[PDB]
């Protein structure tokens, strides 16, 4: 019916057009006769008839009169439904402002009039005056007046001077203003003046005026004159059991406003006492403002119920506003919920369903089937039959769902798997059985967690659920290519018990003709479930692609493993079972089965695993008793010894032999050491206490204790929890975060004193409060996420670009925290990555890096590869297939249509519930690389470092990078480049609080204004007696040395300045403040000598601030361009600092906070993008300096560190698309032949296609700077508005998109969701491409 949405202001004529009449009386319904009072807020004459197809007075009562209006009461007898549609209007007795365009920063009227908002508010509410048209008097058209000035000018001028006050004054002021005239005036003016703050405000204003005159809007419409009142049915006076009709607050506000209007009109008729009508118009303005928004201007509280009233805006914004309450997520009538039990018998795609719930849900299908078999001719007969549940209705129901899928959902649906599709199976009771594996996928325990059901009723939806969201399709998380179907517990225990080996168990030493023989031998009670035997086994293989050879071997194994072998489906070799088969082993087996055999045998194999695991777990009878957890017989001794240690340490302290802080440190250290001792002793006594004997003396073996069998198998709980249970509970943490001296020497099996329990409670409550807050915080985070990437749909199949990122294995300095294999697994190469031997292309330029190519790369051991990321794809309004790469949760490349944005947001936000809230020591061998290093050789054969971007790297034998540290300015080098060193050797150490003035050219040194008393303070080293000088800068001392500047001239051995080796610029070594110089005047300098020495979150909020990209506290300032450093005038607001370019000009003398430490010298030639005052690098500056690849690398590395700190893994594609989103905005630099302004903020896509179209012609394009907004502000500044409307603001975006007439083309997920049509993402992508290829020609 449409393909777009237009929004703008409403002219009074338009509003009066909408209405079917004018409400005049405030009272709504007479109570002695429940009828809409005539010409009231519910009047039938104005809105519609109450009874369906019946006159109000009762005259006409039949469909024979559809259309006529009565004459006793005058109502148009039609369908009552129309009362849901018809609107009313109120002819306001005097103009009044519109509270939105007055108090929505920036106020539309304010910018439209160049008048400060305070004066506008003071003139709207009748407490000022405004002269208009600027008559013969010296009064400007925008000037305001108070009382005395107004009356004095009135005495001085009786005419030609029109000082009106109030709303209608502003209306006249607007309607008198010429739009395009002032527009072109400011246009011609903007190219005239300075600075850029005035130019910024003025370009904002001319943008407003141009958007205004462009759209059909007219400024006088911004002041309401006829207020449209909502249809009655949408504000229904809901009744109670008697006549206590609950007055919806909208009717209250409307009654207040219409009452003010009626009273004001009556006053206007009775000779109008001037001040009285003044105050009355003020009151009416106030009431209308309250109706449009109860927020500003105080409140409008209902009677005796101290709470504000829901205004109109209050019915749109917020969690109860129509957007987040009824439009985006609407309640469904065709579903149900219950509590979930286990039901561990059903197959992987099935799911339990209570007879009651199915009989209630599928009721229409049952009616249809009954009508088919004719068992009930009428529908009411079928309803009766279902009501009685005849013995045939159950057969019918069982028939009607034989393949009909169903949807199961968990309450917090963090990620995509929160809703899955199953086939229902009828059961008894009221619980909802579901497979245990998927309940590990839902993050669903059985603590009473409820689940909702849904029935897809149309054929498309049935087949869609069967094809897409059926459990046998989702077996890999869209976040990581790991398998989501992981046998969690109670089966890993079962299989682990089934695969072990008692050294002497009944049946050991036999030979079995096959697995079935072992199974029979076991069930008959002749051989233990796990005893070493010799079993013949026929493991199949695939020698050639497709074949299945058989190699009947005779392997030494155990009965349990042989029994389990009856489940592997003619694929995997025997080595996948022969091991102890813990939990990680089970995940590995399932993974390799999905890798070799495909999918269907893998799901059958997983179900068989689950069945046999539960079976033999039950048959095992694993049971934890009190005597299972053992205490090592040294724990008492170890604790007593550590007690003696801490006692003598404390005595030493009170004996005055150690400071209290270091004493605390020693105490906590010996306590942690004793804790580790007890833990190791407990482990070594528990895991091997089983010392059994076979045909003789004794043998050890891994324990058979129930505990540590639930642990070694990884079934439940780690060794850290075991030692916290049997062994010592260890140290505990104070509420602040500090650690108590005395730890919990006890353990759970033994008793716990009151104090120990108290401290444990400290810790536990800390954890619980953290969870209770992080849940809500992560919810808000993921909600913000999904509303900034909800547009991304993979449309193009190949953007055809060449720019990617240089993916390289991360190295935090220690080991490689992440190799290149996983960071590049499944992502198409941007460039044809060739092996280190050049001229031989290893991989073509558009290869999907599936696993075998990653194997090849590992073989040739490539350092880094360029890859086609998403942040560089060239798709208009989307992203191409290749630039997204491997479709995680599947194997192939992505299919055109998958809404990568939403799944990325979900994958990022799901683990949010698991977040929180001097020397160099090489390790391996290999060459020693030093990148971007300007250093000088001292008088000791070393290499002292003289630059800031010197990066040390340890390279292994394969030429690939292994370690990387950041050697700062002023470090010593025990070795040079190409020096094979062994680990641990301290190749570099430095005093952190020394920023030396080491020289790169030796000789002598002379002084330029290095004088004591005034500039410098001389003091003796009272320890020894050397005449040290504390050289103060201009800032350090008083003003007596502002102009006086030190300069250590690097002079020849006679006292004259020589140049620098390589160039002709000598070293004028200036000084920073607090310079403790030792080398007296004229003393020889050796190249590289210290001429002076001067000293110097973490969880969900971290990633939050990172995605918002908000400027951190005192960010690390960088250099805009290159050149030589030079200070300026102190206290220029901030101290001056310029960087002279190599050849260009330096028009900027940037201001820097003088107080905060400045890391740069004055004789340094600082390349752009270098640390000036260390700290966090704000992402804005990062982008604006080093392009987009720098900022995307930085953000992905930071967030990925944050996640890897918690053990969760997230593939970088998702954060990549997110950063691609939060920098889709752009700013314009020049103007060019394009119709774009200078400072106008435009979308990178639109400006890029405009440049493309202009380059199609001969004209020039406009240069652009990629912007970068926080996810929230980026989403708010979206091309479409309805998305941005519903997301977070829906009171500014509406005003703006209205006053500009931003016709919203839907072309997006959330928009189409709101409208209710299909989505451009799913099969709806096929639908929409068919449409835009046919409907739009």
């Amino acid at each position: 019916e449409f393909d777009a949405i237009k929004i703008a202001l409403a002219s009074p004529d338009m509003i009066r057009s909408w209405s079917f009449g004018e409400v005049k009386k405030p009272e709504t319904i007479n109570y002695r006769t429940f009828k809409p009072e005539r010409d009231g807020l519910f009047c039938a004459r104005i809105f519609g008839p109450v009874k369906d197809y019946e006159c109000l007075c009762g005259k006409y009562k039949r469909l024979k009169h559809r259309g006529v209006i009565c004459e006793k009461c005058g109502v148009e007898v039609t369908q009552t439904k129309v009362r849901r549609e018809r609107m009313g209007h109120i002819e306001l007795a005097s103009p009044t402002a519109h509270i939105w365009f007055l108090k929505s920063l920036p106020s539309r009227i304010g910018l439209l009039l160049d008048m400060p908002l305070r004066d506008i508010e003071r003139v709207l509410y009748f407490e000022s005056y405004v002269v208009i048209e600027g008559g013969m008097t010296n009064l400007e058209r925008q000037q305001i007046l108070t009382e005395e000035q107004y009356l004095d000018a009135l005495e001085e001028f009786g005419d030609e001077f029109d000082a009106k006050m109030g709303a209608e004054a502003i209306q006249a002021l607007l309607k008198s203003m010429d739009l395009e005239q002032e527009c072109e005036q400011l246009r011609e003016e903007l190219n005239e003046t300075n600075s850029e703050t005035k130019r910024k405000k003025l370009t904002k204003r001319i943008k407003l005026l141009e958007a205004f005159v462009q759209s059909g809007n007219k400024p006088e419409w911004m002041i309401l004159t006829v207020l449209p009142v909502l249809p009655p049915d949408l504000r229904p006076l809901v009744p109670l059991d008697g006549g206590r009709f609950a007055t919806s607050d909208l009717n209250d506000l409307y009654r207040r406003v219409i009452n003010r209007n009626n009273r004001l009109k009556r006053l206007l008729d009775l000779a109008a006492p001037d001040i009285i009508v003044r105050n009355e118009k003020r009151m009416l303005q106030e009431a209308v403002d309250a109706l449009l928004d109860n927020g500003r201007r105080g409140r409008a509280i209902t009677g005796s119920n101290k709470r504000p009233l829901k205004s109109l805006a209050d019915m749109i914004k917020g969690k109860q506003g129509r957007f987040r309450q009824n439009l985006l997520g609407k309640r469904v009538d065709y579903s149900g919920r219950s509590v979930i039990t286990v039901g561990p018998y059903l197959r992987l795609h099935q799911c339990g369903l209570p007879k009651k719930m199915a009989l209630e849900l599928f009721k229409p299908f049952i009616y249809g089937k009954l009508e088919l078999r004719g068992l009930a001719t009428t529908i009411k007969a079928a309803k009766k039959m279902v009501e009685r549940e005849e013995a045939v209705v159950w057969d019918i129901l069982d028939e009607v769902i034989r393949e009909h899928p169903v949807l199961l959902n968990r309450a917090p649906t963090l990620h995509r798997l929160g809703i899955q599709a199953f086939e229902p199976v009828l059961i008894e009771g009221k619980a909802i059985q579901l497979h245990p594996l998927v309940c590990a996928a839902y993050n669903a325990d059985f603590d009473g967690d409820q689940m909702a059901v849904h029935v897809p009723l149309t054929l498309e939806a049935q087949l869609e659920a069967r094809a897409l969201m059926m459990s046998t399709n989702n077996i890999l998380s869209p976040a990581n290519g790991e398998p989501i179907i992981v046998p969690s517990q109670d089966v890993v225990l079962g299989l682990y018990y089934m695969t072990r080996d008692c050294v002497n168990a009944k049946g050991e030493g036999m030979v079995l003709t096959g697995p079935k023989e072992a199974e029979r031998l076991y069930r008959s009670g002749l051989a233990s479930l796990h005893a070493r035997v010799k079993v013949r086994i026929t493991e199949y293989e695939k020698d050639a692609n497709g074949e299945l050879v058989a190699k009947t071997s005779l392997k030494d194994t155990t009965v349990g493993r042989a029994i389990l072998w009856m489940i592997v489906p003619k694929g995997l070799p025997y080595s996948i079972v022969n091991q102890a088969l813990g939990k990680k082993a089970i995940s590995k087996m399932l993974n390799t089965c999905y890798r070799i055999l495909g999918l269907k045998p893998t799901v059958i194999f997983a179900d068989q695993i689950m069945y046999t695991g539960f079976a033999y777990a039950a048959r095992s009878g694993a049971s934890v008793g009190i005597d299972d957890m053992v205490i090592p017989e040294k724990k008492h001794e170890i604790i007593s010894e550590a007690e003696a240690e801490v006692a003598e340490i404390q005595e030493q302290f009170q004996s005055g032999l150690v400071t209290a802080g270091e004493r605390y440190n020693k105490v906590i250290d010996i306590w942690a050491a004793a804790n580790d001792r007890v833990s190791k002793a407990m482990m070594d006594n528990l895991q091997t206490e089983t010392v059994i004997n076979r045909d003789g003396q004794e043998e050890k073996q891994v324990s058979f204790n129930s505990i540590y069998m639930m642990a070694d198998s990884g079934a439940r709980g780690s060794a850290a929890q075991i030692r916290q249970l049997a062994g010592m509970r260890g140290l505990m943490a104070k509420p602040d975060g500090s650690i108590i001296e005395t730890p919990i020497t006890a353990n759970f099996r033994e008793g716990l004193n009151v104090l120990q329990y108290f401290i444990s409670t400290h810790g536990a409550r800390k954890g619980l409060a953290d969870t209770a807050l992080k849940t809500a915080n992560s919810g808000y985070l993921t909600r913000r996420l999904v509303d900034v990437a909800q547009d991304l749909v993979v449309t193009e199949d190949d953007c055809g670009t060449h720019e990617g990122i240089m993916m390289t294995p991360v190295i935090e300095g220690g080991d490689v925290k992440e190799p290149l294999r996983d960071r590049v697994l499944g992502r198409v190469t941007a460039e044809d990555v060739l092996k280190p031997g050049t001229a031989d292309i290893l991989v073509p330029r558009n290869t999907l890096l599936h696993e075998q190519w990653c194997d090849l790369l590992e073989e040739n051991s490539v350092d880094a590869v360029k890859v086609r990321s998403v942040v560089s794809c060239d798709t208009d309004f989307g992203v191409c297939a290749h630039c997204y790469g491997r479709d995680l949760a599947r194997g192939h490349i992505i299919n055109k249509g998958e809404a990568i944005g939403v799944i990325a947001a979900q994958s990022i936000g799901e683990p949010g519930t698991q977040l929180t809230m001097s020397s160099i020591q090489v390790k391996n061998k290999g060459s020693i690389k030093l990148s971007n290093v300007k250093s000088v050789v001292n008088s000791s054969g070393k290499l002292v470092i003289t630059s800031r971007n010197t990066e040390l790297k340890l390279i292994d034998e394969f030429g690939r990078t292994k370690e990387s540290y950041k050697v700062p300015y002023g470090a010593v080098l025990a070795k040079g480049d190409g020096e094979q060193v062994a680990g641990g050797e301290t190749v570099a150490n430095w005093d952190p609080h020394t920023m030396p003035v080491i020289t790169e050219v030796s000789g002598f040194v002379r002084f330029t204004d290095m004088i004591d008393g005034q500039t410098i303070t001389r003091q003796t080293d009272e320890l020894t007696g050397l005449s040290s000088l504390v050289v103060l800068d201009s800032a350090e001392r008083t003003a007596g040395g502002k102009d006086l500047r030190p300069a250590l001239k690097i002079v020849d051995a006679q006292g004259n300045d020589v140049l620098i080796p390589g160039t002709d610029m000598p070293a004028q070594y200036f000084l920073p403040g607090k310079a403790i110089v030792q080398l007296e005047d004229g003393v020889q300098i050796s190249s590289g000598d210290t001429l002076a020495r001067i000293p110097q979150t973490g969880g969900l909020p971290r990633v939050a601030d990172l995605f918002e990209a908000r400027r951190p506290k005192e960010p690390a300032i960088l250099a805009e361009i290159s050149g030589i450093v030079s200070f300026g005038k102190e206290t220029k607001g901030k101290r001056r600092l310029v960087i002279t370019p190599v050849d260009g000009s330096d028009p900027y003398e940037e201001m820097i906070p003088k107080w905060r430490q400045l890391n740069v010298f004055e004789g340094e030639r600082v390349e752009r993008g270098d640390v000036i005052s260390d700290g966090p690098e704000a992402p804005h500056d990062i982008l604006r300096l080093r392009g987009v690849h720098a900022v995307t690398r930085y953000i992905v590395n930071e967030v990925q560190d944050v996640y890897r700190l918690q053990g969760v893994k997230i593939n970088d594609k998702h954060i990549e698309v997110i950063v691609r989103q939060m920098l889709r905005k752009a700013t314009i630099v020049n103007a060019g032949s394009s119709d774009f302004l200078e400072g106008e903020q435009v979308e990178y896509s639109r400006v890029k296609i405009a440049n493309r179209e202009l380059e199609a012609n001969g004209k020039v394009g406009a240069t652009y700077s990629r912007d970068l907004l926080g996810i929230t502000k980026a989403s708010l500044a979206t091309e479409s508005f309805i998305s941005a409307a519903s997301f977070q603001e829906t009171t500014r975006v509406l005003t703006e998109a209205a006053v500009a007439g931003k016709r919203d083309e839907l072309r997006g997920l959330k928009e189409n969701v709101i409208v209710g049509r299909l989505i451009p993402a799913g099969t709806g992508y096929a639908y929409h491409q068919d449409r835009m290829r046919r409907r739009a020609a």
Binding site: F2, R322, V332
Partner: protein, 99 residues
Amino acid sequence: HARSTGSYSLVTQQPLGGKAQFGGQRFGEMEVWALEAYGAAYTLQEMLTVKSDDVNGRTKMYKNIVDGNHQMEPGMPESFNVLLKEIRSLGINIELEDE
């Protein structure tokens, strides 16, 4: 408890909420994001319009599914028309574009 059909909210033609009111479950924001994460376009569409709103559309779906035909005739959810009328009740003019 489950809900096939029944009453509906009068201000917004949606099914009521609550076991007592015989209402049905609420398909929430995160539920919609999940549903559209999969390519479940048609499922999300029918769960939006014809299940909960488009009173004519849902009566048509009922009458058409008792007749053994699982095809939907969707439309405009009356909640959206309610939003239209609320905005239009403000000074803002919002329309459905002709084409």
